[PDB]
Design an enzyme around this catalytic site. Structure first.
Site, mmCIF file in Angstrom:
data_model
loop_
_atom_site.group_PDB
_atom_site.id
_atom_site.type_symbol
_atom_site.label_atom_id
_atom_site.label_comp_id
_atom_site.label_asym_id
_atom_site.label_seq_id
_atom_site.Cartn_x
_atom_site.Cartn_y
_atom_site.Cartn_z
ATOM 1 N N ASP A 24 -18.245 -3.227 -35.977
ATOM 2 C CA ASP A 24 -18.125 -4.667 -35.891
ATOM 3 C C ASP A 24 -19.169 -5.427 -35.083
ATOM 4 O OD1 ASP A 24 -16.788 -7.287 -35.596
ATOM 5 O OD2 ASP A 24 -14.874 -6.224 -35.805
ATOM 6 N N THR A 25 -20.096 -6.075 -35.785
ATOM 7 C CA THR A 25 -21.148 -6.861 -35.141
ATOM 8 C C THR A 25 -20.523 -8.067 -34.434
ATOM 9 O OG1 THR A 25 -21.601 -7.668 -37.430
ATOM 10 C CG2 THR A 25 -23.135 -6.221 -36.491
ATOM 11 N N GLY A 26 -19.460 -8.640 -35.017
ATOM 12 C CA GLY A 26 -18.753 -9.784 -34.467
ATOM 13 C C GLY A 26 -17.768 -9.464 -33.365
#
Ligand SMILES: CC(C)[C@H](NC(=O)[C@H](Cc1ccccc1)C[C@H](O)[C@H](Cc1ccccc1)NC(=O)OC(C)(C)C)c1ncc[nH]1
Lengths: 99, 99
Positions: free
Chosen positions: B25-27
């Site tokens: 998950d980049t977010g």
């Protein structure tokens, strides 16, 4: 480009004449934007994450420009904390995760 | 490796002896593991999510082997639905986003 994740990967988007900042989210299947008064017909969608639930309006075939690239998908105008460009638009622009 | 976002970026993680799957998950600024056993002490921490805020336990210096790669960082154990490997571990393994 190549983004190093030490910094939140916020990019600039142009959607329906408005310009706002959105985070490229690989952990999001759908794209969610807030404060964008979008035209057209909209359907429902109850989308969910951790914490739970959120009620969003589902708008299809919306033109959205993500850091100079144009893609057409499903944008959920929602009560979200930040703007999210989910995988459904990230696949369109050719976004890959590398390590 | 390079991951195409057509399908969720689910990778296998070895954490505290347990084998589980987690989403890259980049977010996510933090990593959260869905209620699993981790031995020791912890700090209260609470972070926001879409549709909420959840109470998590801030465990530090927890070894994680994210697809054979070892990384030592902060792992929150909490009531999350999907297991997330956020930027605090993705930076360690040298994960970048590309387009
Ligand atoms: C961590 C996880 C957490 N990140 C998220 O919750 C982000 C969005 C956000 C960023 C920053 C502040 C608020 C919200 C969303 C996550 O990526 C979640 C992960 C998830 C996937 C599948 C099921 C349940 C959850 N994704 C998400 O909410 O988007 C979808 C489209 C799946 C609804 C975060 N980052 C910073 C502070 N908290």
């Amino acid at each position: 480009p190549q983004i190093t994740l030490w910094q939140r990967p916020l990019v600039t988007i142009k959607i329906g004449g408005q310009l706002k900042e959105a985070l490229l989210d690989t952990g999001a299947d759908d794209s969610i934007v807030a404060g964008i008064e979008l035209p057209g017909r909209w359907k429902p969608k109850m989308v969910g994450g951790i914490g739970g639930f959120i009620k969003v309006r589902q708008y299809d075939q919306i033109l959205i420009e993500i850091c100079g690239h144009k893609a057409i998908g499903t944008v959920l105008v929602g009560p979200t904390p930040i703007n999210i460009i989910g995988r459904n638009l990230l696949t369109q622009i050719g976004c890959t995760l590398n390590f």
